[PDB]
């Protein structure tokens, strides 16, 4: 039995909030905090969530519960279909945490932090290539970005972004075709590009635009938020916010002792205990998330920003990729460890984007050992009676599985799949004989070209707030860390964001073909959709998980002290 999305979205406290005082928040991370206040240089969702009170790495635009752009935030955006342009207008009194003005150059500088390879960003994508002159700037063929212009100059509050083709998702946040953050140029201009990621000016002592500012950052541990006097909007209620990382093992004990008022991104296996904790209300909603299984299919060319599917591996055969997916027992694993929060995935598009999901799409949600064996049989891999593993040309079907650290069931689940691949005759061993730590895993997947010492890994995503998956799978993007390149898949991705897909009936059919083709080609295998839950202490006022709530950090407060 799986739990329905009938969790309470908001905790409506009858108690009035005080002045201030001190809120204590934590994020469940077994890895140390990675402090990076520039959106272009940060790859993890862990710190992106922790940077919330500071502006969410300096987010600009406001949003309704459907992630669509609305007016009234730090900046406003307007589209023009026939000219193929976006116009971004910053607020006249938009300021950094040091009092200095946020200008048009600050927004453009964000594009440079990703496009200019000297900063070492992993966020380059085919989506960004749609901006006129950005590809030429990215390759170094130009000195500036021609598609980005300033109607009122670099000091002004207006920026114009020129596109080659208009995209449907442009009315929605997380589209990726244009950026939504600003970076402090004046403060960071004297720092060499290759030094910017490790500079104290982007890590421990930065400048922000949000309601709170980091008074102190304890590297790899915590943030000390205090109210920002130069914030354009409402004055926050609280005196301070402390945002800390908390290990999986210590999370439940931290709740019992009231050390934290809120813990975000808790694993499904702990919900059993969290629900029994009085003094806390457990909120919840459909996670904008997917976990899936990756195959290592090639390498990434960094100089030319292109994924090359050229790795010499038995995983280049389609029948081998499908069988390994069909061998897994995701459903059995879910029913045993996830407390009804994880539903086995049928495709790549999560239930949260309900409009573009289809029950017609059959995937790998149901285990089929017989079909797995057959697919391997009719492909040329014959089982060896002696060893118990399939062989071809005398080469044994031996693969490396880079499994990852997680909850207390992480090591169990990893071995669970290994035994299933054992049943079909595929020899699978763990990477270096032990589970991989999150921080070093990300570096191993994102850094070019790169790694050839793994075959199977598990990817977990805090997905973009827009259904399109160009920033995950497009040929130019490093985030495609399996490094596949398929003409049909590219066409499917492009057709999803084509001019015809402005028509939602057409875009619906483009998503359905994409999901069916991704399942068939089996470059990646959809594992889980998740339902997220959040324990909130009963003293907290104005707390909500609603995606439409914009002034959340300013309106949030407490009813009592410790």
């Amino acid at each position: 039995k799986l739990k329905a999305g009938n969790f309470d979205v908001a905790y409506q406290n009858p108690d009035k909030a005080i002045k201030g005082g001190n809120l204590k928040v934590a994020y469940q991370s077994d890895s140390p905090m990675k402090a990076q206040w520039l959106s272009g240089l940060s790859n993890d969702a862990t710190f992106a969530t922790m940077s919330g009170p500071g502006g969410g790495q300096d987010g600009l635009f406001f949003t309704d519960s459907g992630f669509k752009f609305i007016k009234g935030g730090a900046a406003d955006v307007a589209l023009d279909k026939e000219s193929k342009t976006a116009t971004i207008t910053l607020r006249k009194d938009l300021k950094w945490s040091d009092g200095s003005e946020v200008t048009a150059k600050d927004y453009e500088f964000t594009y440079e932090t990703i496009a200019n390879p000297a900063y070492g960003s992993d966020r380059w994508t085919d989506s960004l290539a749609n901006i006129v002159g950005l590809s030429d700037y990215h390759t170094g063929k130009a000195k500036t970005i021609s598609g980005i212009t300033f109607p009122d100059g670099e000091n002004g509050k207006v920026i114009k972004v020129q596109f080659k083709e208009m995209k449907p998702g442009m009315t929605q946040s997380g589209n990726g075709y244009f950026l939504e953050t600003v970076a402090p140029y004046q403060y960071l201009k004297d720092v060499a590009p290759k030094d910017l990621a490790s500079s104290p000016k982007t890590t421990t002592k930065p400048l922000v635009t949000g309601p709170f500012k980091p008074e102190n950052v304890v590297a790899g541990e915590s943030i000390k938020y205090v109210p920002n006097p130069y914030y354009w909007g409402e004055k926050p209620k609280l005196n301070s916010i402390t945002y800390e990382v908390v290990s999986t093992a210590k999370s439940v004990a931290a709740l019992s002792s009231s050390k934290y008022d809120i813990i975000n991104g808790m694993v499904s296996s702990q919900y059993k205990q969290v629900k029994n904790l009085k003094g806390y209300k457990v909120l919840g909603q459909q996670a904008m998330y997917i976990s899936l299984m990756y195959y290592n299919l090639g390498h990434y060319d960094a100089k030319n920003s292109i994924n090359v599917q050229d790795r010499k591996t038995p995983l280049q055969d389609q029948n081998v990729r499908q069988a390994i997916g069909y061998a897994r027992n995701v459903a059995e694993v879910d029913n045993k460890f996830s407390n009804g929060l994880s539903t086995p995935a049928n495709s790549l598009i999560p239930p949260i984007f309900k409009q573009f999901t289809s029950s017609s799409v059959k995937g790998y949600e149901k285990q089929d050992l017989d079909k797995a064996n057959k697919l391997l049989d009719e492909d040329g891999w014959k089982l060896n009676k002696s060893t118990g593993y399939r062989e071809k040309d005398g080469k044994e079907l031996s693969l490396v599985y880079a499994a990852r650290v997680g909850d207390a069931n992480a090591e169990t689940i990893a071995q669970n799949y290994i035994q299933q691949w054992k049943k079909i005759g595929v020899k699978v061993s763990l990477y270096n004989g032990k589970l991989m730590e999150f921080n070093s895993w990300v570096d191993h997947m994102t850094t070019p070209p790169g790694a050839n010492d793994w075959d199977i890994t598990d990817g977990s995503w805090s997905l973009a707030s827009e259904p399109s998956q160009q920033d995950l799978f497009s040929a130019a993007a490093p985030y495609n860390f399996g490094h596949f390149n398929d003409s049909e898949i590219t066409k499917d991705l492009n057709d999803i964001d084509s001019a015809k897909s402005e028509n939602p009936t057409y875009r619906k059919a483009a998503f359905v073909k994409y999901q069916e083709d991704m399942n068939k080609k089996a470059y990646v295998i959809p594992t889980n959709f998740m339902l997220n839950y959040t324990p909130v202490n009963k003293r907290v006022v104005g707390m909500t998980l609603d995606y439409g709530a914009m002034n959340t950090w300013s309106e949030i407060g407490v009813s009592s002290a410790k």
Binding site: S29, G265, D407, S462, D471
Partner: peptide
């Protein structure tokens, strides 16, 4: 807003 690597939850 943008895609991000998550720990596994």
């Amino acid at each position: 807003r943008p895609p991000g690597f998550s720990p596994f939850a």
